[PDB]
Amino acid sequence: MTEYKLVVVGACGVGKSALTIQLIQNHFVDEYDPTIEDSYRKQVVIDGETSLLDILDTARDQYMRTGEGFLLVFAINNTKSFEDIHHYREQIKRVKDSEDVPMVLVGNKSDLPSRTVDTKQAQDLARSYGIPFIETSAKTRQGVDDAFYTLVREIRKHKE
Ligand SMILES: Nc1nc2c(ncn2[C@@H]2O[C@H](COP(=O)(O)OP(=O)(O)O)[C@@H](O)[C@H]2O)c(=O)[nH]1
Numbered sequence: 001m002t003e004y005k006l007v008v009v010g011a012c013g014v015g016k017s018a019l020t021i022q023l024i025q026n027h028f029v030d031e032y033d034p035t036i037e038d039s040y041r042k043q044v045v046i047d048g049e050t051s052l053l054d055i056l057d058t059a060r061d062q063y064m065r066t067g068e069g070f071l072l073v074f075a076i077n078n079t080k081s082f083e084d085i086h087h088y089r090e091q092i093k094r095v096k097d098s099e100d101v102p103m104v105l106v107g108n109k110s111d112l113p114s115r116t117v118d119t120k121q122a123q124d125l126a127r128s129y130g131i132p133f134i135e136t137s138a139k140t141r142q143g144v145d146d147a148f149y150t151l152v153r154e155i156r157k158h159k160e
């Protein structure tokens with residue numbers, strides 16, 4: 001019965017869309033229009049509780065204001081995208097007017113061998129933020145459920 005508005009943010013090309021589509025449609029899209037910004041709905045069950053997810057895949061001022069949780073996505077083979085995380089976080093903090101916003105740090109493209117962002121680096125950032133860090137591959141589906149479900153768990157602990 002509960003609904004959760006989730007927002008997926010991060011630099012262009014990190015796999016925001018691919019991640020969202022795997023969760024929604026259960027397949028990996030190789031070439032999804034980089035400019036398309038849209039929301040996707042799905043009824044899920046998480047730790048036994050039924051819930052409707054409304055997920056904005058950015059590429060809206062509305063979702064920022066009404067978003068209850070955010071995935072901060074970088075790709076592990078894109079140092080610049082990891083360096084952009086702080087900016088995304090501060091922007092959310094500003095709009096939401098809080099310092100306790102539910103967020104999850106997501107390191108995507110974990111199947112790729114060209115790693116330039118150490119796991120240690122990401123974990124150290126997430127620790128400073130007090131948020132979970134989850135490694136994912138939209139391509140193999142590794143960690144996809146875990147990223148979204150973890151965010152939902154962070155939302156629930158926050159409003160409780
Ligand atoms: N190898 C690999 N490629 C990915 C992964 N996620 C996304 N991609 C590719 O990276 C490119 C951009 O992905 P996209 O989802 O559009 O990124 P977005 O701009 O953040 O929405 C596309 O070529 C995707 O196929 C992943 O986990 N592994």
Ligand SMILES: [Mg+2]
Pocket residue numbers: 016017018033034035036057058059
């Ligand atoms: Mg996209």
